[PDB]
């Protein structure tokens, strides 16, 4: 029903960098949150979050060794959805004035997923879809989540 004349921002935050010991058994949480401007929410903006893995799953990737990685399936807030009823892990949410954030998280369980020392990064992509004067448009950005082991 509405279009904007300044493109919607895509505003993502993530968990700050974490450090853990190789022998820790505690679950490690990582989360991301996406929003946009109040005017874009009024206009009907839809925000997105996705990873770089198969089916847009989130990948915690060792800096040195290509094959060392964990592909993680996200959990999302109750107002968000997965693409195609969950056949893909890409996430979207139509924001509203009473519900302004898309929130999602993953977890590494050291008990089932072995912890190797070193640096890990996890790339997340976020976007916002809206209409401007030329019709459908989107802006996207990226942020990298970090984990240091031992």
Residue numbers in the entry: 7 to 156
Q: What did the original publication write about this model?
A:
Different AAF variants are expressed by different EAEC strains, where they are required for the bacterium's adherence to small and large intestinal mucosa. As with Afa/Dr polyadhesins, AAF consist of two secreted protein subunits, a major subunit (A) and a putative minor subunit (B). In the fiber, subunits are linked together by donor strand complementation (DSC) with an N-terminal Gd donor strand segment of one subunit inserted into the hydrophobic cleft of a neighboring subunit. In this study, we report X-ray crystallographic and NMR studies of monomeric, donor-strand-complemented major and minor subunits of AAF/I from the German outbreak strain and AAF/II from EAEC strain 042 and provide an atomic resolution model for the structure of the entire fimbriae.
The DSC-monomers of the major subunits (AggAdsA and AafAdsA) have a classical Ig-like fold that consists of two β sheets packed against each other in a β sandwich. Instead, it has additional strands C and D, which form the edge of β sheet 2 (CDC1C2FGdA2) in this subunit. Both strand F and the donor strand (Gd) at the other edge of sheet 2 are longer in AggAdsA than in AafAdsA. The donor strand of AggAdsA inserts seven classical donor residues in to the acceptor cleft, which is two more than AafAdsA and other structurally characterized subunits from FGL CU systems. In addition, AggAdsA contains an α helix in the loop between B and C1 strands, which is absent in AafAdsA. These features give AggAdsA a more elongated shape than AafAdsA. To examine if fibronectin is a common receptor for AAF, we studied AggAdsA-fibronectin interactions using surface plasmon resonance (SPR). The experiment revealed specific binding with a dissociation constant of 16±2 µM. We focused the mutagenesis on surface patches comprising proximal pairs of lysines (including Lys51 and Lys109, Lys55 and Lys103, and Lys73 and Lys76) and the three closely positioned lysines Lys73, Lys76, and Lys78. All the double mutants exhibited significant decreases in fibronectin binding and, despite the absence of the cooperatively expected for a polymeric AggA fiber, the affinity for the triple mutant of monomeric AggAdsA dropped below the detection limit of the experiment. The pocket is particularly well pronounced in AAF/I. Three closely positioned lysines (73, 76 and 78), mutations of which practically abolished the binding, are located in the loop between the C2 and Ć strands at the bottom of the subunit.
